[PDB]
Amino acid sequence: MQLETAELEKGLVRTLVDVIGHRLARDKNNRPNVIRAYPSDNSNDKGLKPDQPFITVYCQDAATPYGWVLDKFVEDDVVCYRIAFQIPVLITVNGKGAHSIMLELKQRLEMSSVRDLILEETGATVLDTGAIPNDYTYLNTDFENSAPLVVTLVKNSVLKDERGSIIERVIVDGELVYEEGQEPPEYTIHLDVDSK
C-alpha cells in the first residue's frame, strides 16, 4: 500500500456519510453534504457552498517522526522499503448546532466499531483527537457557528526500488602467513558459493 492523501480524504469522506450522515443536510441526490476542502474541477471550475449543515475534510500535512526508514526487505527480486507516516486531518462543521454535531462525531470515532470501518476504507489507524472550539465568524449580516476538529492518522507506505539487485554468488580468496607481510603466502584458500 502506498500513502496518498488524495485517497485518505476520499476514504474519510465515504466513511463519514455513514457515520454521521443522519445529522447533516442532503443535496438534490439525497446524499449527505460532505465534501473536500477547496472544491474545484477542470483546473478552473469552483464548487458552490452546499446547504448547511455540512462537513469539510482537509489534509494539513504529513511527517515522519518515527525515524526515516522502518523496514528494508526483498519481496520478489525487486527491493522494497517501508516508511511510517503521520497525517493530521481537519474536519469542520458549518451551520447551526455545529458543536452539538462535532461532540457526537467525537463520541463515535472512539468506539471499537467505526475505527474498523476507517481502517477498512483508508487502511489507517486513528492515533489522537484534539479538542473542539466553538467559533463564530461574522461573514455578512449574520454570524456562522463552526466547530473544527483535528484527527491524526498513522499509515505505513511501501515503495519498489526498480534499480536494486541481489547477490546470488560470492567469490572469496584468502591467505595464511606465519609473519605479517610474508610475501609468498604459506597457503591460499579459494572458494566459490552459488545460491543454487
Binding site: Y136, Y138, T141, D142, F143
Partner: protein, 132 residues
C-alpha cells in the same frame, strides 16, 4: 433665514456650571438643568466611516448608532475643561443627542453667520447617582 429655521427642537442646557468631585472622588454633574426652545436644520452627516442609523451586530445583541449635522444661529457649547462647563443636549425623535463638535463661522458675514455642530446619539445605559 427660512431654510436655517426649518426644524424646531428642544435643548437641555445645564445652566449652572458648579459640577465638582465628591469627598469620595465620584463625579457630580451640575445640578440646575434648564430646557429651552431652539430652531435650526438637521441633516445626515456623510463623511468617511460615519454611521447614520447603522445597525451593529454584536455577541450581546443589536445596537443602533446615529449622528447628524446641525446648522443654527444659536450658540450651543460642548464640554470644556478649561472653562469648566459641560456640553448641551438636543432632543431629536425623543432621544438625546450630545454635542461633540463645533465649528465657529460667526462674525464672518452679515446675513450668513451661523454655527455647525456634530451631534451623536447617546448610548443606552442604566442610571446611577452619587450626589453628596
Amino acid at each position: 433665514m427660512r431654510l436655517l429655521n426649518r426644524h424646531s427642537f428642544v435643548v437641555k442646557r445645564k445652566v449652572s456650571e458648579d459640577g465638582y468631585y465628591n469627598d469620595d472622588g465620584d463625579w457630580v454633574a451640575s445640578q440646575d438643568i434648564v430646557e429651552v426652545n431652539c430652531k435650526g436644520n438637521i441633516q445626515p452627516y456623510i463623511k468617511g466611516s460615519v454611521k447614520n442609523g447603522t445597525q451593529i451586530a454584536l455577541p450581546e445583541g443589536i445596537r443602533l448608532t446615529d449622528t447628524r449635522i446641525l446648522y443654527t444661529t444659536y450658540k450651543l457649547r460642548t464640554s470644556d475643561d478649561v472653562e469648566w462647563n459641560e456640553s448641551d443636549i438636543v432632543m431629536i425623535d425623543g432621544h438625546e443627542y450630545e454635542v461633540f463638535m463645533t465649528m465657529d463661522w460667526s462674525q464672518q458675514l452679515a446675513h450668513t453667520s451661523h454655527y455647525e455642530y456634530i451631534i451623536i446619539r447617546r448610548d443606552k445605559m442604566n442610571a446611577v447617582r452619587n450626589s453628596r
